């Protein structure tokens, strides 16, 4: 269902 | 622009023995380029995701562990090694990101964990996850 991978780059900060 | 390419392969043994908590972080050994510039890097994985929104995924980041300079820019690419030994499911940063010591960049949703755990995909042979990282740093 949900995408297998999300190519969005970010910095390890939990939400 | 002056660019140094280097790479690191990380095998996480006994992947099914990771803790069942979204907090959990596993880190690689440190690695570096041959440029001999005091930069040390490692990989960081959250096997159960970074947080609630990403709990269905494995998260994967490149961390600049040690760096005596203000900043360094680098492109990066992560992939998984399959049970044939070939790279699969790679994702790259596309552009170079600005790292400082203690900073990481990467993918909160690197790969959906159910796919990882699905035997037919051959990504956890022998209960081991092998990750490959390619880094291109501006010097």
PDB file of C-alpha atoms in Angstrom:
ATOM      1  CA  UNK A   1       0.000   0.000   0.000  1.00  0.00           C
ATOM      2  CA  UNK A   2       2.413   2.712   1.328  1.00  0.00           C
ATOM      3  CA  UNK A   3       5.385   3.489  -0.959  1.00  0.00           C
ATOM      4  CA  UNK A   4       8.224   1.010  -0.736  1.00  0.00           C
ATOM      5  CA  UNK A   5      10.842   3.815  -0.548  1.00  0.00           C
ATOM      6  CA  UNK A   6      10.523   7.597  -0.232  1.00  0.00           C
ATOM      7  CA  UNK A   7      13.442   9.406  -1.772  1.00  0.00           C
ATOM      8  CA  UNK A   8      12.976  12.537   0.359  1.00  0.00           C
ATOM      9  CA  UNK A   9      16.248  13.497   2.043  1.00  0.00           C
ATOM     10  CA  UNK A  10      16.195  14.842   5.603  1.00  0.00           C
ATOM     11  CA  UNK A  11      18.225  15.019   8.826  1.00  0.00           C
ATOM     12  CA  UNK A  12      17.627  12.523  11.710  1.00  0.00           C
ATOM     13  CA  UNK A  13      15.234  14.560  13.790  1.00  0.00           C
ATOM     14  CA  UNK A  14      12.181  12.561  14.970  1.00  0.00           C
ATOM     15  CA  UNK A  15       8.799  14.207  14.479  1.00  0.00           C
TER      16      UNK A  15
ATOM     17  CA  UNK B   1      35.009  21.728  -7.435  1.00  0.00           C
ATOM     18  CA  UNK B   2      37.330  18.933  -6.066  1.00  0.00           C
ATOM     19  CA  UNK B   3      35.632  15.622  -5.300  1.00  0.00           C
ATOM     20  CA  UNK B   4      36.693  12.464  -3.457  1.00  0.00           C
ATOM     21  CA  UNK B   5      34.611   9.296  -3.909  1.00  0.00           C
ATOM     22  CA  UNK B   6      34.626   6.511  -1.335  1.00  0.00           C
ATOM     23  CA  UNK B   7      32.398   3.736  -0.110  1.00  0.00           C
ATOM     24  CA  UNK B   8      31.547   1.496   2.801  1.00  0.00           C
ATOM     25  CA  UNK B   9      29.807  -1.876   3.090  1.00  0.00           C
ATOM     26  CA  UNK B  10      27.990  -2.622   6.368  1.00  0.00           C
ATOM     27  CA  UNK B  11      26.595  -6.024   7.352  1.00  0.00           C
ATOM     28  CA  UNK B  12      24.125  -6.038  10.215  1.00  0.00           C
ATOM     29  CA  UNK B  13      24.095  -9.567  11.574  1.00  0.00           C
ATOM     30  CA  UNK B  14      21.139 -11.107  13.436  1.00  0.00           C
ATOM     31  CA  UNK B  15      18.707  -8.511  12.140  1.00  0.00           C
ATOM     32  CA  UNK B  16      15.698 -10.208  13.840  1.00  0.00           C
ATOM     33  CA  UNK B  17      17.356  -9.590  17.220  1.00  0.00           C
ATOM     34  CA  UNK B  18      17.053  -5.817  16.950  1.00  0.00           C
ATOM     35  CA  UNK B  19      15.056  -4.292  19.788  1.00  0.00           C
ATOM     36  CA  UNK B  20      11.316  -3.782  19.232  1.00  0.00           C
ATOM     37  CA  UNK B  21      11.413  -0.043  19.857  1.00  0.00           C
ATOM     38  CA  UNK B  22      11.227   2.892  17.474  1.00  0.00           C
ATOM     39  CA  UNK B  23      13.919   4.633  19.511  1.00  0.00           C
ATOM     40  CA  UNK B  24      16.556   2.023  18.700  1.00  0.00           C
ATOM     41  CA  UNK B  25      19.559   3.140  16.648  1.00  0.00           C
ATOM     42  CA  UNK B  26      22.286   0.924  15.242  1.00  0.00           C
ATOM     43  CA  UNK B  27      25.464   2.488  13.927  1.00  0.00           C
ATOM     44  CA  UNK B  28      28.263   1.277  11.661  1.00  0.00           C
ATOM     45  CA  UNK B  29      31.957   1.520  12.358  1.00  0.00           C
ATOM     46  CA  UNK B  30      33.485   4.802  11.286  1.00  0.00           C
ATOM     47  CA  UNK B  31      34.996   5.107   7.829  1.00  0.00           C
ATOM     48  CA  UNK B  32      36.799   7.755   5.828  1.00  0.00           C
ATOM     49  CA  UNK B  33      38.123   8.755   2.418  1.00  0.00           C
ATOM     50  CA  UNK B  34      41.746   8.434   1.511  1.00  0.00           C
ATOM     51  CA  UNK B  35      42.100  12.231   1.501  1.00  0.00           C
ATOM     52  CA  UNK B  36      43.484  12.117   5.082  1.00  0.00           C
ATOM     53  CA  UNK B  37      41.562  15.198   6.257  1.00  0.00           C
ATOM     54  CA  UNK B  38      40.321  14.020   9.717  1.00  0.00           C
ATOM     55  CA  UNK B  39      36.766  13.385   8.467  1.00  0.00           C
ATOM     56  CA  UNK B  40      35.096  10.325   9.980  1.00  0.00           C
ATOM     57  CA  UNK B  41      31.724   9.056   8.854  1.00  0.00           C
ATOM     58  CA  UNK B  42      29.364   6.294   9.856  1.00  0.00           C
ATOM     59  CA  UNK B  43      26.001   4.886   8.858  1.00  0.00           C
ATOM     60  CA  UNK B  44      23.017   4.963  11.196  1.00  0.00           C
ATOM     61  CA  UNK B  45      19.933   2.724  10.966  1.00  0.00           C
ATOM     62  CA  UNK B  46      16.657   2.850  12.857  1.00  0.00           C
ATOM     63  CA  UNK B  47      15.440  -0.731  12.263  1.00  0.00           C
ATOM     64  CA  UNK B  48      11.922   0.046  13.555  1.00  0.00           C
ATOM     65  CA  UNK B  49      11.776   3.533  12.100  1.00  0.00           C
ATOM     66  CA  UNK B  50      12.613   6.937  13.477  1.00  0.00           C
ATOM     67  CA  UNK B  51       9.138   7.876  14.733  1.00  0.00           C
ATOM     68  CA  UNK B  52       5.421   7.146  14.529  1.00  0.00           C
ATOM     69  CA  UNK B  53       4.999   8.309  10.905  1.00  0.00           C
ATOM     70  CA  UNK B  54       7.941   6.158   9.795  1.00  0.00           C
ATOM     71  CA  UNK B  55       7.371   3.115  12.030  1.00  0.00           C
ATOM     72  CA  UNK B  56       6.677   0.895   9.008  1.00  0.00           C
ATOM     73  CA  UNK B  57      10.079   1.653   7.494  1.00  0.00           C
ATOM     74  CA  UNK B  58      13.747   1.184   8.105  1.00  0.00           C
ATOM     75  CA  UNK B  59      15.541   4.555   8.263  1.00  0.00           C
ATOM     76  CA  UNK B  60      19.082   5.046   6.959  1.00  0.00           C
ATOM     77  CA  UNK B  61      21.375   8.034   7.434  1.00  0.00           C
ATOM     78  CA  UNK B  62      24.938   9.123   6.760  1.00  0.00           C
ATOM     79  CA  UNK B  63      26.453  10.751   9.837  1.00  0.00           C
ATOM     80  CA  UNK B  64      29.538  12.933   9.873  1.00  0.00           C
ATOM     81  CA  UNK B  65      30.907  11.744  13.220  1.00  0.00           C
ATOM     82  CA  UNK B  66      34.093  13.730  13.411  1.00  0.00           C
ATOM     83  CA  UNK B  67      35.108  16.830  11.476  1.00  0.00           C
ATOM     84  CA  UNK B  68      37.371  19.678  12.675  1.00  0.00           C
ATOM     85  CA  UNK B  69      36.144  22.029   9.896  1.00  0.00           C
ATOM     86  CA  UNK B  70      33.000  24.138   9.900  1.00  0.00           C
ATOM     87  CA  UNK B  71      31.322  22.255   7.100  1.00  0.00           C
ATOM     88  CA  UNK B  72      31.693  19.788   4.276  1.00  0.00           C
ATOM     89  CA  UNK B  73      29.386  19.155   1.338  1.00  0.00           C
ATOM     90  CA  UNK B  74      28.817  15.640   0.054  1.00  0.00           C
ATOM     91  CA  UNK B  75      26.530  13.620  -2.169  1.00  0.00           C
ATOM     92  CA  UNK B  76      25.544  10.139  -1.066  1.00  0.00           C
ATOM     93  CA  UNK B  77      23.907   6.976  -2.270  1.00  0.00           C
ATOM     94  CA  UNK B  78      22.681   3.966  -0.282  1.00  0.00           C
ATOM     95  CA  UNK B  79      21.808   0.507  -1.578  1.00  0.00           C
ATOM     96  CA  UNK B  80      21.011  -2.963  -0.260  1.00  0.00           C
ATOM     97  CA  UNK B  81      22.936  -6.066  -1.264  1.00  0.00           C
ATOM     98  CA  UNK B  82      20.632  -8.929  -2.247  1.00  0.00           C
ATOM     99  CA  UNK B  83      21.158 -12.660  -1.823  1.00  0.00           C
ATOM    100  CA  UNK B  84      22.871 -12.740  -5.262  1.00  0.00           C
ATOM    101  CA  UNK B  85      25.456 -10.139  -4.153  1.00  0.00           C
ATOM    102  CA  UNK B  86      24.150  -7.337  -6.429  1.00  0.00           C
ATOM    103  CA  UNK B  87      23.034  -3.862  -5.370  1.00  0.00           C
ATOM    104  CA  UNK B  88      19.296  -3.259  -5.278  1.00  0.00           C
ATOM    105  CA  UNK B  89      16.821  -0.615  -4.157  1.00  0.00           C
ATOM    106  CA  UNK B  90      19.417   2.183  -4.210  1.00  0.00           C
ATOM    107  CA  UNK B  91      18.546   5.814  -3.487  1.00  0.00           C
ATOM    108  CA  UNK B  92      20.818   8.842  -3.890  1.00  0.00           C
ATOM    109  CA  UNK B  93      20.759  12.344  -2.532  1.00  0.00           C
ATOM    110  CA  UNK B  94      20.993  13.820  -6.092  1.00  0.00           C
ATOM    111  CA  UNK B  95      22.638  16.969  -4.837  1.00  0.00           C
ATOM    112  CA  UNK B  96      25.304  17.570  -2.218  1.00  0.00           C
ATOM    113  CA  UNK B  97      24.170  18.254   1.332  1.00  0.00           C
ATOM    114  CA  UNK B  98      25.978  20.346   3.937  1.00  0.00           C
ATOM    115  CA  UNK B  99      27.337  18.292   6.838  1.00  0.00           C
ATOM    116  CA  UNK B 100      28.843  19.531  10.089  1.00  0.00           C
ATOM    117  CA  UNK B 101      30.107  17.378  12.908  1.00  0.00           C
ATOM    118  CA  UNK B 102      27.269  15.417  14.473  1.00  0.00           C
ATOM    119  CA  UNK B 103      24.940  16.077  11.534  1.00  0.00           C
ATOM    120  CA  UNK B 104      23.328  13.374   9.472  1.00  0.00           C
ATOM    121  CA  UNK B 105      21.412  13.300   6.256  1.00  0.00           C
ATOM    122  CA  UNK B 106      19.467  10.441   4.769  1.00  0.00           C
ATOM    123  CA  UNK B 107      16.133   8.725   4.324  1.00  0.00           C
ATOM    124  CA  UNK B 108      13.539   8.379   7.073  1.00  0.00           C
ATOM    125  CA  UNK B 109      11.630   5.990   4.820  1.00  0.00           C
ATOM    126  CA  UNK B 110      14.475   4.169   3.185  1.00  0.00           C
ATOM    127  CA  UNK B 111      12.632   0.868   2.738  1.00  0.00           C
ATOM    128  CA  UNK B 112       9.358  -0.593   3.976  1.00  0.00           C
ATOM    129  CA  UNK B 113      10.203  -3.207   6.582  1.00  0.00           C
ATOM    130  CA  UNK B 114       7.630  -5.796   5.469  1.00  0.00           C
ATOM    131  CA  UNK B 115       9.419  -5.922   2.085  1.00  0.00           C
ATOM    132  CA  UNK B 116      12.704  -6.375   3.908  1.00  0.00           C
ATOM    133  CA  UNK B 117      11.280  -9.198   5.975  1.00  0.00           C
ATOM    134  CA  UNK B 118       9.615 -10.891   2.969  1.00  0.00           C
ATOM    135  CA  UNK B 119      11.741 -13.984   2.322  1.00  0.00           C
ATOM    136  CA  UNK B 120      11.021 -13.932  -1.418  1.00  0.00           C
ATOM    137  CA  UNK B 121      12.940 -10.665  -1.870  1.00  0.00           C
ATOM    138  CA  UNK B 122      16.190 -12.169  -0.587  1.00  0.00           C
ATOM    139  CA  UNK B 123      17.339  -9.090   1.304  1.00  0.00           C
ATOM    140  CA  UNK B 124      17.902 -10.768   4.705  1.00  0.00           C
ATOM    141  CA  UNK B 125      19.783 -13.945   3.758  1.00  0.00           C
ATOM    142  CA  UNK B 126      21.008 -15.710   6.903  1.00  0.00           C
ATOM    143  CA  UNK B 127      19.287 -13.004   8.995  1.00  0.00           C
ATOM    144  CA  UNK B 128      21.842 -10.421   7.750  1.00  0.00           C
ATOM    145  CA  UNK B 129      21.177  -6.982   6.240  1.00  0.00           C
ATOM    146  CA  UNK B 130      24.053  -5.695   4.055  1.00  0.00           C
ATOM    147  CA  UNK B 131      24.036  -2.015   3.151  1.00  0.00           C
ATOM    148  CA  UNK B 132      26.382  -0.248   0.750  1.00  0.00           C
ATOM    149  CA  UNK B 133      27.077   3.497   0.945  1.00  0.00           C
ATOM    150  CA  UNK B 134      28.833   5.587  -1.720  1.00  0.00           C
ATOM    151  CA  UNK B 135      29.908   9.077  -0.737  1.00  0.00           C
ATOM    152  CA  UNK B 136      31.226  11.925  -2.894  1.00  0.00           C
ATOM    153  CA  UNK B 137      32.702  14.718  -0.751  1.00  0.00           C
ATOM    154  CA  UNK B 138      33.745  18.167  -1.948  1.00  0.00           C
ATOM    155  CA  UNK B 139      37.354  18.995  -1.000  1.00  0.00           C
TER     156      UNK B 139
END
